[PDB]
Design a protein around this nucleic acid. Structure first.
Lengths: 385, 407, 169
RNA sequence: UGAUCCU
RNA sequence: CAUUGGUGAGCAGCGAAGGAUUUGGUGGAUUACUAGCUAAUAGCAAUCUAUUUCAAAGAAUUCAAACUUGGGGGAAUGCCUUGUUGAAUAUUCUUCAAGUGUAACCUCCUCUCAAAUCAG
């Protein structure tokens, strides 16, 4: 416990009169240290479509996918850029599967698996739609939910299809994989998120999450609380460990396009022109219920921790850097990294992921993970069963 | 409005010198570490499949061995490097475990030798033609001890520099003596084997050719107990660790391990083998018993489990007649009817290399994992398994058939 | 990726990241190599029809043999596929499953046609000339390099008039 | 752990 | 000799305080101009926060839901379907077969060309 060398950043009001959420990002960029203040990027690439964002599980490479033709893998911290592909088919998402050397893009029809340089490795005959393209490196399993009812699991270690699960739910409106559990979460128009394992052809458990369609879903690091948003201007705080929505934030001004969860407990809600993050909102009490406005400054009622409004955009998606305190918000013209104080964890474990990794360390670690892949039957509702 | 962020500081995690190794900050928070069962399970399965890939028991033989067949192997109990092998022709051959070559060899007996045993180097070769001969290791035939029985056995004794013979009658000799001191018999029959225990060395275990086990006490010059067993017994071994229990090998394909306090109930039974188990030998740890059959096969198993975790066989050895365990618990010497004494591992994956402490701590961790992931079935199919020969697999099938007809 | 060890190899028995069985040996790319098609999906735009040839060629082989519709419709298939030149011969019926490749329909492509006629030196130089707007098929200058040209249209490809590469030859 | 083939 | 080739010298000739070339960057147009942001009848634009929350309104194919699959084989192991068997309480689940059943899962094809070189 005392070996833990680095401690989180904080944000403190210092008055009741002074307010926490009112800080702006140019105002933040004054006091943050120079490399960390400079780690906020403004990539306005206004020519192509709205931009999809994903950092790798280590923050070392950023992958972006504009809706029209852009596919871009930068070695994000440095000036290096690996991939810049212009496919005139339209794309939806992308993820690095194992390392920055191999990634996968979610196109109009077919998923593509791709080299760092931008070369074509593997076009999938299957995956005939691809809306959410997500990965779990602990099974080496690219799990993809298109606009189809089905859900496809490709084991890119072997390079073969594991399984394909028809939901009977229709087009997938959301998918968030569980880091702690590797159960997949699919969200559809009935207000229903289904938990999934590749073995079980019926879902593990269905959840009538909200009314209307599922806008998005996002899961804790601990796998305890998953924050779900419907298109009904509502966001539920599901505690998966006992399958209860802790708080039901009703009547947003606009339904959130996405939700995202940091490591230390931050929650990101992006209505699209606005991005708003709460601190410690996932806890058990309804005092920790995330609320927009606490009248009278009552400590029980909970205000948002950090706010932002995008002027000329309706942003697409967002994702924290997993070890740093920023979050990449993909807007129509591009990418902002909005600086949080305490979102990411300060003390990573190198033996799990390496944010500072040599290429020789990388090819050691890749072989280490491929030795430690699990075959797909081990995806279960509990890791420990 | 206190504004504070995370700073990696770009110097702690990435070191100054180019020759300096990386700093490796760890957080053992379980949220960072998702799979404590499954990833450790896959490491254990990798280790078990690797130990099936690291299943290379064979080292080599000792020299070119006997032409006529090894029947008894003596080991000097101080000498970890040297050993002795007696042939039914009568040629005694002495080997060094480093060189694996004949240190010295002698035309001992024109009859068979039945046992070689070592007490002051000094070797003692018991015959079929009523003669034991005393040889020294650098020359030959110091003194021959002539007895009235054709010598069905021998055993050494460290204290008072003594050795008894096994025969029709067991009669205890000394080094200086040419006639024995005292001759013992519980029952009036020829005795197949003898063994002094090593600690509280005065006690002896004496098999009996008409299905007998006697426990001889040198302090009384009289046996102190005898259980008349079902079938006759081949050979014996006292554990060097426990010093009051011993395993013996029986005429049926079964080895029984008995206790000096209670012979009326055995400590244990072991029946993986398919023929008359020739020889047993016990680890200096006291962990595992290794036993060689009349069948062309040896087997290693631990004392408490009771079933063969390890089985040894190959092409050019048969009816092995003898198996002798290490001084250092690391390698078993294996005598042959085929005459050639092979050097075999105690564990085929355990290697002689003194290990770098990265891989050594990893190997200790992996086998610790192998035990806490033991009784899972998918681990079990790789953990039991290795090739068994065709007739012996059929012979185990035959034994299961006959025991199924019995019940 | 690693020239991995003797001890690594046996544990990673079935894995690969370069040649997959769903990736079908990267066979399509070897045709995308030899004919230099711009988009990938042009291959699967031929191969989605190419099985559709065989899917009619197979079930017309399942009719009774002297079914007077069967021999007539197969002739109507084969005269059509012989006008487009995607098979060399028309006498046998067996080309409808053996000769119908993506490479055979892809060697009825436009720069393959000019590359046969040696107006161009290589294949990709003809593609560059179509992109430059130098070529025409009878009446029309064609901009598209991916032109399906029939056997009977093959005489109509000339250089376009007043050019700088028609005066080059 | 196992199970095929040829004189 | 035509050089109708340019170099090269030159000259006539043109010719206002230089001429000729080559390129970087940026701005302007490249469709016909009604302002920016937001939660939008309004507020903002130095700010929406210590009115943004109560309130109302808000839940069908009783489970319609691959309109998407290169083509042949098969499709062991899966699944699907009914046939058929047991259990629990009119339905799931155990068990089992029949399926020129099957976008899982196995192979064959969807490469070898009047392109060129090369012996004869």
């Amino acid at each position: 416990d005392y070996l833990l060398p680095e401690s989180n950043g904080y944000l403190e009001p210092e008055n009741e009169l002074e307010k926490t959420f009112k800080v702006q990002q140019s105002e933040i960029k004054s006091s943050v240290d120079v490399s960390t203040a400079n780690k906020a990027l403004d990539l306005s690439l206004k020519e192509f479509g709205p931009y999809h964002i994903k950092y790798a599980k280590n923050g070392t490479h950023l992958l972006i996918t504009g809706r029209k033709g852009h596919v871009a893998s930068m070695d994000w911290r440095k000036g290096q850029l690996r991939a810049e592909l212009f496919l005139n088919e339209t794309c939806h998402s992308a993820t690095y599967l194992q390392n920055e050397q191999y990634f996968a893009v979610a196109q109009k029809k077919y998923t593509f698996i791709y080299d760092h340089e931008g070369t074509e490795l593997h076009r999938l005959k299957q995956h005939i739609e691809a809306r959410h393209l997500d990965f779990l490196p602990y099974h080496y399993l690219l799990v993809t939910a298109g606009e189809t009812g089905w859900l496809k699991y490709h084991d890119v270690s072997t390079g073969q299809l594991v399984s394909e699960l028809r939901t009977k739910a229709g087009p997938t409106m959301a998918m968030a994989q569980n880091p702690w559990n590797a159960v997949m979460h699919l969200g559809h128009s009935n207000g229903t998120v289904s938990l999934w394992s590749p073995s079980m052809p019926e879902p593990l458990v269905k959840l009538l999450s909200a009314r209307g369609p599922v806008n998005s879903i996002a899961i804790d690091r601990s796998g305890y609380y998953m924050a779900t948003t419907g298109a009904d201007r509502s966001m539920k705080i599901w505690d998966i460990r006992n399958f209860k929505q802790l708080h039901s934030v009703e009547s947003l001004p606009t339904p959130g396009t996405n939700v995202s969860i940091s490591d230390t407990g931050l929650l990101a809600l992006s209505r699209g022109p606005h991005v708003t993050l709460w601190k410690d909102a996932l806890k058990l009490s309804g005092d920790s219920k995330p609320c927009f406005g606490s009248m009278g400054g009552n400590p029980h009622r909970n205000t948002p921790y950090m706010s932002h409004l995008f002027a000329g955009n309706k942003v697409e998606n967002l994702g924290f850097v997993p070890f740093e305190d920023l979050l990449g918000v993909g807007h129509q013209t591009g990418i902002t990294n909005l600086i949080v104080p305490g979102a990411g964890e300060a003390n990573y474990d190198a033996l799990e992921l390496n944010p500072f990794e040599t290429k020789k360390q990388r090819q050691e670690q890749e072989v280490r993970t491929l030795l430690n892949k699990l075959p797909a039957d081990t995806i279960t509702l509990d890791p420990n069963s | 409005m206190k504004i504070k962020t995370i700073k990696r500081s770009a110097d702690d995690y990435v070191p100054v010198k180019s020759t300096q190794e990386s700093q490796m900050p760890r957080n053992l928070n379980p949220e960072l570490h998702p799979f404590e069962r499954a990833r450790e399970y896959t490491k254990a399965l990798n280790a078990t499949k690797l130990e099936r890939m690291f299943a290379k028991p064979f080292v080599g033989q000792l020299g070119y061995g006997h032409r006529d067949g090894v029947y008894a192997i003596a080991k000097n109990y101080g000498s970890l490097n040297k050993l002795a092998t007696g042939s039914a022709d009568g040629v005694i051959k002495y080997w060094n475990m480093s060189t694996r070559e004949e240190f010295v060899s002698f035309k001992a007996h024109y009859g068979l030798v039945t046992g070689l045993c070592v007490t002051q180097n000094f070797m003692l070769s018991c015959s079929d033609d009523k003669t034991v001969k005393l040889w020294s290791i650098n020359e030959g035939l110091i003194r021959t001890f002539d007895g009235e029985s054709a010598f069905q056995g021998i055993d050494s004794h460290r204290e008072n520099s003594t050795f008894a013979t096994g025969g029709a009658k067991i009669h205890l000799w000394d080094v200086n003596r040419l006639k024995p001191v005292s001759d013992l018999s519980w029952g009036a029959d020829n005795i197949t084997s003898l063994k002094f225990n090593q600690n509280e060395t005065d006690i002896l275990a004496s098999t009996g050719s008409d299905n007998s086990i006697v426990l001889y006490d040198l302090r009384t010059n009289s046996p102190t107990q005898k259980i008349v067993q079902t079938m006759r017994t081949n050979a014996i071994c006292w554990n060097p660790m426990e010093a009051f229990n011993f395993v013996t090998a029986n005429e049926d394909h079964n080895a029984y391990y008995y206790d000096m306090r209670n012979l009326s109930r055995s400590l244990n039974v072991f029946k993986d083998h398919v023929s008359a188990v020739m020889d047993v030998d016990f680890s200096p740890t006291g962990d595992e018993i290794v036993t060689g059959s009349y069948d062309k096969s040896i087997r290693i198993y631990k004392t408490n489990h009771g079933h063969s975790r390890e089985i040894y066989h190959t092409k050019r050895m048969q009816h092995v007649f003898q198996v002798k365990y290490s001084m250092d618990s690391k390698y078993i010497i294996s005598g042959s009817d085929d005459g050639n004494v092979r050097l075999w591992r105690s564990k085929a994956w355990e290697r002689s290399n003194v290990k770098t402490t990265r891989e050594k701590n990893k190997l200790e961790y992996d086998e610790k994992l192998k035990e806490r992931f033991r009784h899972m079935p998918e681990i079990k199919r790789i953990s039991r398994h290795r090739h068994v020969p065709q007739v012996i697999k059929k012979a185990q099938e035959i034994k299961n058939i006959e025991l199924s007809s019995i019940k | 990726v690693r020239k991995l060890k003797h001890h690594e190899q046996k544990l990673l028995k079935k894995v690969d990241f370069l040649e997959w069985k769903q990736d079908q040996g990267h066979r399509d790319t070897q045709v995308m190599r030899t004919y230099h098609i711009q988009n990938r999906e042009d291959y699967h735009k031929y191969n989605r029809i190419c099985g559709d040839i065989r899917r009619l060629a197979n079930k017309l082989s399942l009719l009774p043999p002297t079914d007077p519709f069967r021999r007539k419709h197969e002739q109507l298939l084969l005269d059509k596929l012989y006008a487009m030149g995607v098979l060399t011969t028309k006498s046998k019926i067996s080309d409808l499953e053996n000769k119908v490749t993506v490479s055979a329909i892809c060697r009825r492509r436009l720069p393959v046609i000019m590359h046969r006629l040696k107006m161009a030196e290589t294949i990709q130089d003809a593609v560059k000339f179509i992109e430059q707007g130098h070529v025409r098929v009878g009446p029309n200058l064609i901009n598209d390099p991916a032109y399906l040209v029939t056997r009977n249209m093959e005489d109509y490809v000339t250089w376009v008039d007043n050019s700088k590469i028609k005066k080059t030859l």
